[PDB]
Amino acid sequence: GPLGSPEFREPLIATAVKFLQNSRVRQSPLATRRAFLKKKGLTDEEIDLAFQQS
Amino acid sequence: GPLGSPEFREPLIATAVKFLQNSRVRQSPLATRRAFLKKKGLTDEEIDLAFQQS
Numbered sequence A, B: 001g002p003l004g005s006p007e008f009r010e011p012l013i014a015t016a017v018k019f020l021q022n023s024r025v026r027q028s029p030l031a032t033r034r035a036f037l038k039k040k041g042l043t044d045e046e047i048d049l050a051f052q053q054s
C-alpha cells in the first residue's frame, strides 16, 4: 500500500511467484488463483507482477 | 493477518526478523519498531512472532 516500503512487499511478490508456479495451485481457475493472492493482501499490481514473473 | 496462509506470512515474518536485527533499526524505541511493522501491514500477533525469533 501507499505507506509501505519495497522491502516488505518484495517477499510477498516472491512467494506469489512460487505460488503461481506450484502444481497444486495451477489446477485452480485463473480467477481463483488471483482471489487467493488478493486474500494474501497483495495489490492488483503485485498480483500482475507475480503473473509476469511466473 | 489471520486469513493469510503460513506460506505467505512466514516469509514476511522472516523479513520482519531481518528488519528487527538491523543495527540502525535497533537504535529506535521499541514502540517505533512495532509501529513501523504495523504500518507495513503486520499484525501484533505476527510482530510478536518476529520478536520471538529475532
Ligand SMILES: CCCCCCCCCCOP(=O)([O-])OCC[N+](C)(C)C
Residues within 6 Å of the ligand: A018, A019, A022, A024, A025, B002, B003, B004, B005, B006, B007
Ligand atoms: C509454495 C506455495 C504453495 C502454496 C499452496 C497452498 C495451498 C492453499 C491452501 C489453502 O489456504 P488457506 O486455508 O486459505 O490459508 C490458510 C489460512 N487459514 C487456514 C485460513 C488460517
